Amino acid sequence: VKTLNPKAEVARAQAALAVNISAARGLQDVLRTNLGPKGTMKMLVSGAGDIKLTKDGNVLLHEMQIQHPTASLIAKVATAQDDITGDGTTSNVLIIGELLKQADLYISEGLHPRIITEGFEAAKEKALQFLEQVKVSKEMDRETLIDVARTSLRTKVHAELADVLTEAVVDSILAIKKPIDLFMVEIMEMKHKSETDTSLIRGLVLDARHPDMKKRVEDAYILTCNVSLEYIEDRVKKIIELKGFVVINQKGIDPFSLDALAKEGIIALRRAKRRNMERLTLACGGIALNSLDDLNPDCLGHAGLVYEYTLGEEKFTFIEKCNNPRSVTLLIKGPNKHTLTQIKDAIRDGLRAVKNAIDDGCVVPGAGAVEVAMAEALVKYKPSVKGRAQLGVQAFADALLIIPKVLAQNSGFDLQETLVKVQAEHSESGQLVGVDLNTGEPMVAAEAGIWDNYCVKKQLLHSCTVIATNILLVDEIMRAG
Amino acid sequence: KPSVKGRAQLGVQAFADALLIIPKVLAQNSGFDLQETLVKVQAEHSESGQLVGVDLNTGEPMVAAEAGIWDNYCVKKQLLHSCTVIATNILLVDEIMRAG
Amino acid sequence: VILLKEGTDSSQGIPQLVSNISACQVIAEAVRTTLGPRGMDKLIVDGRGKATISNDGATILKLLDVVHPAAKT
Amino acid sequence: QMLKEGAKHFSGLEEAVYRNIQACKELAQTTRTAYGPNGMNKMVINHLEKLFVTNDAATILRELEVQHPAAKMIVMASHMQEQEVGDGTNFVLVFAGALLELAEELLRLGLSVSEVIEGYEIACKKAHEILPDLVCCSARDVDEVSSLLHTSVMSKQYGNEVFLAKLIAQACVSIFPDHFNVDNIRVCKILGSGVHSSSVLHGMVFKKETEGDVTSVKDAKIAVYSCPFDGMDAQVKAIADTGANVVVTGGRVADMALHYANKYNIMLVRLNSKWDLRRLCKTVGATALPRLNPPVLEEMGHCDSVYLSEVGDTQVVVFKHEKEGAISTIVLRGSTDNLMDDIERAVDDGVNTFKVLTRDKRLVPGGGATEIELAKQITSYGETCPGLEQYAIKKFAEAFEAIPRALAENSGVKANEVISKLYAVHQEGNKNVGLDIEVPAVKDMLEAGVLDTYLGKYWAIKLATNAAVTVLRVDQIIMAK
Amino acid sequence: QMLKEGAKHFSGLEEAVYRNIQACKELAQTTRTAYGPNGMNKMVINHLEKLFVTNDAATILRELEVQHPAAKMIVMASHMQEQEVGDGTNFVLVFAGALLELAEELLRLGLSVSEVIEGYEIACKKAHEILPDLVCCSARDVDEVSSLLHTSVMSKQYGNEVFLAKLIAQACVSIFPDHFNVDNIRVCKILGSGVHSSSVLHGAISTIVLRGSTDNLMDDIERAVDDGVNTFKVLTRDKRLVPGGGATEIELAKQITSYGETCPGLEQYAIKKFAEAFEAIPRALAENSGVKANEVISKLYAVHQEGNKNVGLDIEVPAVKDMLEAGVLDTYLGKYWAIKLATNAAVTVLRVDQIIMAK
Amino acid sequence: VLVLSQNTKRESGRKVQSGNINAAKTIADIIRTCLGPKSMMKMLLDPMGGIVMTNDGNAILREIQVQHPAAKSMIEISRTQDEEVGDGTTSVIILAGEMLSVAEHFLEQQMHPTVVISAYRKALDDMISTLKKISIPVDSNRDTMLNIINSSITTKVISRWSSLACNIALDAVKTVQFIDIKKYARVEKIPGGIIEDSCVLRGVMINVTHPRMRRYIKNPRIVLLDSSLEYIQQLCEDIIQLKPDVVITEKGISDLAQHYLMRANITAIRRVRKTDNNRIARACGARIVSRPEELREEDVGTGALLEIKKIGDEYFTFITECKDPKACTILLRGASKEILSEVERNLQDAMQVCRNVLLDPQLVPGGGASEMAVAHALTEKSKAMTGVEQWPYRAVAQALEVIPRTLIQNCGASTIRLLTSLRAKHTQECETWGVNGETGTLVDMKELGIWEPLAVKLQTYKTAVETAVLLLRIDDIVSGH
Structure with a gap:
């Protein structure tokens, strides 16, 4: 038979399922080493000798040259888990992986894939519905928000200064919520000094070109200009007449133009990123005209206090006190640049964590606290469904118990042993029972502050089941044309 | 298993699952679905009682005590004993050392 | 994985001293004969033909193809 | 299929630990020989067939071809340490390795990597608390100044003149240290005569180009130029009107611009590095005059002495005796380029050490003394801190025993014997007790003079620690080929 | 670790079931060419340099070193069918192979070996029930005797003198049978002259002086001489002789196939398949005659459901014909047991999956 | 020497027929598992980067770069099936391949395709006549x-x-x-x-x-x-x-x-x-x-x-x-x-x-109801024809049973069992009974609301059969290098 073209691998019978399961399982274990507060970030080096050192699962699975068709799929799962929700990206990869493990166990026993799918699917729905019964109802409460944002910062680098950054996150999110929008929080990272100096400005932070231009304009009227100020004095005359004390140009400014601008007491900056210009027009309420002669006294943004202070030997232009207190800037002061790289990602998640916390009063006990619960629930839900379906549910419940296991894993404690304690304590205290590694024993996650957003868990089961099962159907790829 | 608790809970449960090999195999030597039959037999069992067994001659879970299918006490009793006992020992033997 | 590439021959401990010692000893021996009034001259050829008859170590060590660290010393 | 693509060397868990640790050990031991007056230099020759004979670890690592991930982390530790104070460059290296060595042994036993870090991190903060308490604060004061400078000059190739290099660096860093800066020190390596000829010039030395010009100008009116003197009369004539008897051009000068500057009796100097121009503007008060038309009399710096000395047989202009010379020049002298290289390498270090004093008077009795003390203290500390951490803490201290171990190593003294003896005599002679290589036996470092900077040790522990910790976490990393 | 011993070839499930069936089938095909009047002789030489050109399956199998356990079962069947009546010693074999052949197909479909066993046995018991209702009864009478003896002398080497050999076993087994028993017949192989020189020595113990050009020819004649004698014993002990030519088989295949239609379940397949084995008999008959089985059988079956039992196959003329009107009538008891032994043989072989051989 | 070109393959008799069939039967066992509401989407990968994961046999065969003409024709079958009634594209491929698997069974018994085709063709009309004879x-x-x-x-x-x-x-x-x-x-x-x-x-x-x-x-x-x-x-x-x-x-x-x-x-x-x-x-x-x-x-x-x-x-x-x-x-x-x-x-x-x-507007109950009735009908016609062809008729009819067989297969339940019970109640209570993939049991389609337009099934039988023809006819396939 020649339906394929020369050089076309074909998976057939159980062989496909086997390679697929192991595949997704392998990559699932490799990423399982960075889960938990004791996780370990990975250093991925592409061809150009690049060195990507991060803790987030998604990014990792986006830099690792995966040759496993299955793993590649597992990469698409972690992606849909980082784009829709974000944090926990890892958790998902493990679930789907462990899930396939339980299934295979059954398949090798003689059970047909289809019946197994129905089993898991039957548990999925119920699972998602259980998360709707175990979700902790709170509110835009500043307290709970601080707990979540704090727990999010943990298990990472900034875990050293979670208290500080968390606070800034809550404030920035409280001043950008209309319906929360993260595009209203400008994250500016700067080197020099420690990461304990991070402050929260309520305006813009650009990173006076001429030594004669004022270093601090009060009611500075920004005259946004996109065109270049080179080939001159006539262009400077048109600005002074339009009453523009602070001309933030997107292009370079002719050396001679700066002398005529500083002679008038005009504070003009040059070479401003297009993204900073648009942020200056949406905060101060200014209009960015292309040509220098299209500007007018009615296109000047109203600023309260525009000062240029040194953020580590580097003078930054702070344009805070804007007429619209809905545009805040989260300045990030820290040691090296690489450090701020990770940290900046922490805030990105901190803002998103608080964001969903206010937009959704859901806050379930993380740290597996939910996992174990759902597991025991399904275990008592399988006898009501019976049939080979009973197994599916069970397996889905056993797959949910991977999170708490991995927790006791990355911690060092006995995986199995701990599992028994947590499970025995969970069916005695309630849904608030979690796996606290810092104490080496199961504790009330809702008492330690360890909380997770509903969206996470919910979205989790979703992206998992769908894809996972689909990987049990594709028993042949065949590369042809 | 939920009473003894601890890592033993699993041991006991596993021992229970291992005991389910008899019914499975039966359906295996008959020509009926292994898992399928196990479910029906287990469901009915958790309803009628110790009288529910696997009647291959019918291809469905029936009452052993009714059909007249009964096993001596000594037989069963001796089965688990000789098994678990010897079985475990083999598990402890982590080495043997030989030659050629 | 792998500290140094396939070429950075690392000689530490003693396998470094030895080698450098042996070569230095042998190079010296070469001129060790040009010592005295009846020394043993050496017609150094520069591959291109030009043969140079010298008895002075310097002139000889400056006209020879030296490609060894401990030797160039 | 293949979990990862081709040409991707990976390592997980212990497998990685062994490799990382090993690579670091050999790299830490390689430079270990470059410690103390027994420092055995190395000869590294890059592609360009360039021979580098240095005793400084940093200089070694930054010249060695390192491609090993974890191994590169050691190059960073030595880099930062060299940028902090300079001294102790090798200290961090060796120590970093020992740590990993003791830690790895803990894992193979069954201990969790997590606890390892915690124990080590916790002991890193305890030590940073012990050092400041045990440290021996010294008195500025030329008497105390020479003491520290005299203990930073040894252990090198210029030990024959540890008395000269001491006074030379004692004079320079004591003429303009407002807040001292190691950048106001310009060292020159002039061949000719032994290092016992090194002089201290109060200013900045360079090389002129014109003869007929004034070789030795009194109160000169320096005018720093950067624009070429090529076309030449109006350019050189505009320099004679301002009263500039000394021209320091940045680029090349036209032959007609030289003959004119040679006729105006104006000493002209062409081909002046960009840094030499800046150093001349902050020493005499000259202004970096771009073009040759805007210079005036208020742009001319005053330099009481600008003569042409041919020390070592090479012409050199000495701009000494100024109003507020903020930058002095160290005139080094060497019989060979080899000795001249080593000397300078050490001179800079002393420049940094002195810079440490201006911002930290404290000092500790080096030679292993402090190490043993910390080891003693930390160990006891571990016994006071229950939990599996007690083991990690004590192990951390056991690492400090590698410093004096290396000391007696590069001397041929049985470590096992010298160490045991050191501790015993150290637990009675206190801090001061150390190891005197020149005479294999315990001795009071404070009395022997050997005193290191407190701040020098401080950073070392922190940098090395945090660094090592990182390399240990990333226990799984493929690549992306 | 090493499972059983050293060099102990074992198998389980598919691999096994297949090993056994392959051997049996092949062993059936080999002798399948020795059936019908087109029966072609075989040349078998033992470790004693002895050449035996026989056409009798039993004789053949008992000359071939068959160490293969699974195959041995086929050696017993031919042996037992040769002891009872003799004729059709190849009928029991071929059938056996077929049964297992259409059986393997069933399992490889997803059926239960047991359901396959139940069916074959249920139909087997049924078949033997149709045999007496179809068998052609008869009563000693030199008439029906010379008729059955003639159809018992054919399909053999000495078929050239089917007339004389007919009279030979006609006189003997009609001089002392009082309750006849072949233990009174003494066959003597006297090399020399053709087979037309055969005589009947008189008497509860008659000597049969046989004449044969060569040895192979001698054994061939004698082999069947016993066939005419044994068959006589059966008839005198059982007044029933079904019509052959494959007639009975087809009808039994026509009844069983429909019998499976009235009995659903996993038995249905096994049943209908069991009947498909009887079609192997008329298949072999055509085989030896070089006729297309597929076409001849289909035709035979059609007319068979038209002309009834009698309808058979006349090799001497590629076309269906009435066996009872053509003078073709075999022994009832002969066919009877065959279906029994064969059905039984195949079974035990199947129920045996684990075997620790050695090579 | 070289008859037909040089370096060319050449089949004949038992080699041409055998290959032609298997090739089509094989390409059928590739998408057969993609038939039914429980299909298994495959994930083909062309040599460009386009990963097509579909369930439709057509789109699947249009991606798989084929070589053997025999298989190519199969692609034409799906190209004609999806161009008419769309769905069912797989069904036709499955049947077409099966009809051959049973055909070869007669090619071994030695039954020239002619005698075979004639039947298959006359049988093709049988189904059609039956379809319009039982369609509502x-x-x-x-x-x-x-x-x-x-x-x-x-x-x-x-x-x-x-x-x-x-x-x-x-x-x-x-x-x-x-x-x-x-x-x-x-x-x-x-x-x-x-x-x-x-x-x-x-x-x-x-x-x-x-x-x-x-x-x-x-x-x-x-x-x-x-x-x-x-x-x-x-x-x-x-x-x-x-x-x-x-x-x-x-x-x-x-x-x-x-x-x-x-x-x-x-x-x-x-x-x-x-x-x-x-x-x-x-x-x-x-x-x-x-x-x-x-x-x-x-x-x-x-x-x-x-x-x-x-x-x-x-x-x-x-x-x-x-x-x-x-x-x-x-x-x-x-x-x-x-x-x-x-x-x-x-x-x-x-x-x-x-x-x-x-x-x-004619339509027949899905669930394979049509295929069965026809299969049961054609079987009747076989007995009404007798002759050698009496078997082939049955063969084809028993080849139409693949739709329901493969149907219940992708469900999990027994294929043979369901088949027996299917024909049973199907031979009694009209054709209103079909396979229910959701209940794994034969249910009255007509009463469940499962009906498929005659045309849909009309083209089905027509194509599948006609296909076996042009293929069975393929006497030889030379033309090589």
Whole structure:
């Protein structure tokens, strides 16, 4: 038979399922080493000798040259888990992986894939519905928000200064919520000094070109200009007449133009990123005209206090006190640049964590606290469904118990042993029972502050089941044309 | 298993699952679905009682005590004993050392 | 994985001293004969033909193809 | 299929630990020989067939071809340490390795990597608390100044003149240290005569180009130029009107611009590095005059002495005796380029050490003394801190025993014997007790003079620690080929 | 670790079931060419340099070193069918192979070996029930005797003198049978002259002086001489002789196939398949005659459901014909047991999956 | 020596037939598992980067680069099956391959294809006769006519907007019905918006040369023109003398000709694709003419609404309300070109099934109900034919049972068991009984509401059988290097 073209691998019978399961399982274990507060970030080096050192699962699975068709799929799962929700990206990869493990166990026993799918699917729905019964109802409460944002910062680098950054996150999110929008929080990272100096400005932070231009304009009227100020004095005359004390140009400014601008007491900056210009027009309420002669006294943004202070030997232009207190800037002061790289990602998640916390009063006990619960629930839900379906549910419940296991894993404690304690304590205290590694024993996650957003868990089961099962159907790829 | 608790809970449960090999195999030597039959037999069992067994001659879970299918006490009793006992020992033997 | 590439021959401990010692000893021996009034001259050829008859170590060590660290010393 | 693509060397868990640790050990031991007056230099020759004979670890690592991930982390530790104070460059290296060595042994036993870090991190903060308490604060004061400078000059190739290099660096860093800066020190390596000829010039030395010009100008009116003197009369004539008897051009000068500057009796100097121009503007008060038309009399710096000395047989202009010379020049002298290289390498270090004093008077009795003390203290500390951490803490201290171990190593003294003896005599002679290589036996470092900077040790522990910790976490990393 | 011993070839499930069936089938095909009047002789030489050109399956199998356990079962069947009546010693074999052949197909479909066993046995018991209702009864009478003896002398080497050999076993087994028993017949192989020189020595113990050009020819004649004698014993002990030519088989295949239609379940397949084995008999008959089985059988079956039992196959003329009107009538008891032994043989072989051989 | 070329393969007899079959039977075992509501989507990967993960055999066979012609024909089978009734593309492939697996069974018994084909062909008619002999006539009626177009659009990327798509095909097919021609349904797709913006236009659509010309005409008398109006006055006078008001020029119109036609109130549309000139001459009745000198008042068609609308800033000319709107235009809207070609097909296939409810609304219960009855019927015919062919008949009939067998297979339950029980109740209670993949038990399709238009199954048997022919006929396949 020649339906394929020369050089076309074909998976057939159980062989496909086997390679697929192991595949997704392998990559699932490799990423399982960075889960938990004791996780370990990975250093991925592409061809150009690049060195990507991060803790987030998604990014990792986006830099690792995966040759496993299955793993590649597992990469698409972690992606849909980082784009829709974000944090926990890892958790998902493990679930789907462990899930396939339980299934295979059954398949090798003689059970047909289809019946197994129905089993898991039957548990999925119920699972998602259980998360709707175990979700902790709170509110835009500043307290709970601080707990979540704090727990999010943990298990990472900034875990050293979670208290500080968390606070800034809550404030920035409280001043950008209309319906929360993260595009209203400008994250500016700067080197020099420690990461304990991070402050929260309520305006813009650009990173006076001429030594004669004022270093601090009060009611500075920004005259946004996109065109270049080179080939001159006539262009400077048109600005002074339009009453523009602070001309933030997107292009370079002719050396001679700066002398005529500083002679008038005009504070003009040059070479401003297009993204900073648009942020200056949406905060101060200014209009960015292309040509220098299209500007007018009615296109000047109203600023309260525009000062240029040194953020580590580097003078930054702070344009805070804007007429619209809905545009805040989260300045990030820290040691090296690489450090701020990770940290900046922490805030990105901190803002998103608080964001969903206010937009959704859901806050379930993380740290597996939910996992174990759902597991025991399904275990008592399988006898009501019976049939080979009973197994599916069970397996889905056993797959949910991977999170708490991995927790006791990355911690060092006995995986199995701990599992028994947590499970025995969970069916005695309630849904608030979690796996606290810092104490080496199961504790009330809702008492330690360890909380997770509903969206996470919910979205989790979703992206998992769908894809996972689909990987049990594709028993042949065949590369042809 | 939920009473003894601890890592033993699993041991006991596993021992229970291992005991389910008899019914499975039966359906295996008959020509009926292994898992399928196990479910029906287990469901009915958790309803009628110790009288529910696997009647291959019918291809469905029936009452052993009714059909007249009964096993001596000594037989069963001796089965688990000789098994678990010897079985475990083999598990402890982590080495043997030989030659050629 | 792998500290140094396939070429950075690392000689530490003693396998470094030895080698450098042996070569230095042998190079010296070469001129060790040009010592005295009846020394043993050496017609150094520069591959291109030009043969140079010298008895002075310097002139000889400056006209020879030296490609060894401990030797160039 | 293949979990990862081709040409991707990976390592997980212990497998990685062994490799990382090993690579670091050999790299830490390689430079270990470059410690103390027994420092055995190395000869590294890059592609360009360039021979580098240095005793400084940093200089070694930054010249060695390192491609090993974890191994590169050691190059960073030595880099930062060299940028902090300079001294102790090798200290961090060796120590970093020992740590990993003791830690790895803990894992193979069954201990969790997590606890390892915690124990080590916790002991890193305890030590940073012990050092400041045990440290021996010294008195500025030329008497105390020479003491520290005299203990930073040894252990090198210029030990024959540890008395000269001491006074030379004692004079320079004591003429303009407002807040001292190691950048106001310009060292020159002039061949000719032994290092016992090194002089201290109060200013900045360079090389002129014109003869007929004034070789030795009194109160000169320096005018720093950067624009070429090529076309030449109006350019050189505009320099004679301002009263500039000394021209320091940045680029090349036209032959007609030289003959004119040679006729105006104006000493002209062409081909002046960009840094030499800046150093001349902050020493005499000259202004970096771009073009040759805007210079005036208020742009001319005053330099009481600008003569042409041919020390070592090479012409050199000495701009000494100024109003507020903020930058002095160290005139080094060497019989060979080899000795001249080593000397300078050490001179800079002393420049940094002195810079440490201006911002930290404290000092500790080096030679292993402090190490043993910390080891003693930390160990006891571990016994006071229950939990599996007690083991990690004590192990951390056991690492400090590698410093004096290396000391007696590069001397041929049985470590096992010298160490045991050191501790015993150290637990009675206190801090001061150390190891005197020149005479294999315990001795009071404070009395022997050997005193290191407190701040020098401080950073070392922190940098090395945090660094090592990182390399240990990333226990799984493929690549992306 | 090493499972059983050293060099102990074992198998389980598919691999096994297949090993056994392959051997049996092949062993059936080999002798399948020795059936019908087109029966072609075989040349078998033992470790004693002895050449035996026989056409009798039993004789053949008992000359071939068959160490293969699974195959041995086929050696017993031919042996037992040769002891009872003799004729059709190849009928029991071929059938056996077929049964297992259409059986393997069933399992490889997803059926239960047991359901396959139940069916074959249920139909087997049924078949033997149709045999007496179809068998052609008869009563000693030199008439029906010379008729059955003639159809018992054919399909053999000495078929050239089917007339004389007919009279030979006609006189003997009609001089002392009082309750006849072949233990009174003494066959003597006297090399020399053709087979037309055969005589009947008189008497509860008659000597049969046989004449044969060569040895192979001698054994061939004698082999069947016993066939005419044994068959006589059966008839005198059982007044029933079904019509052959494959007639009975087809009808039994026509009844069983429909019998499976009235009995659903996993038995249905096994049943209908069991009947498909009887079609192997008329298949072999055509085989030896070089006729297309597929076409001849289909035709035979059609007319068979038209002309009834009698309808058979006349090799001497590629076309269906009435066996009872053509003078073709075999022994009832002969066919009877065959279906029994064969059905039984195949079974035990199947129920045996684990075997620790050695090579 | 070399008969047919050099380095060429050569089969014969038992080698040509055997290969031809298996090749087709194999390509069938590739998508067979993709049949049913429990199919298993495969994930092919062409040598470019396009990973196509579909379930439709067609799209699957159109990706798999084939070599062996035998398999290629199979691709043609799906190319003819998906071009008619869409779905079932797999069914036909499965059968076609099976018919061969059983055929070869006779090729071993030695039964020349002729004797075989003849049967297969005569048997093919048997199924057909039976199909129309047991099919139920389901009522045009917009109500049911919709449930027929819907059940097809279901389970597709268009399923989301099935309802809308259903009506689209409903109105389209209900208009081109005079015998319903599908070659009058001009589909037009424009990017922008969602699939809910679609609609059905009653008239040809073109993709106002003068901004002052008539934007809409009450009684448009179009005049199809191919030639150009460029070099003009005389050419523009021969048209106006035909009492027109809209000139559809195929080529470009000169600026001059734009003023003359605008001067006489005549909307001129220059540069009109040739395809558009043919659609306007069949819907409006305007004869297409070459040069203008040949334009008379007879070639002038007639419309009832020619309005120019901006379908996305793109002013498309709408010549709707034609006298004979026998050629409608379906405007399909899609997020991209992928959801645009997909939705387009689902609509087209939908138009076909609907093209049946108005011509021959016959349909048979799915679940394989049809296949079984036919299989049971053909079996009867076998006994009514006897002869050697008596077996082949049964063979084919028993080959149609694969649909239900493979159906229950992808469910998990027993394939054989269900088969026995199937034929059973199927031989008693009519054909109303079919396989239920959701209950794993044979259920009365007719009563469950599962019915498939005869045509759908009509083409099925026809194709599958005919296929086995052209293949069985393939005597030899040489022609090599």
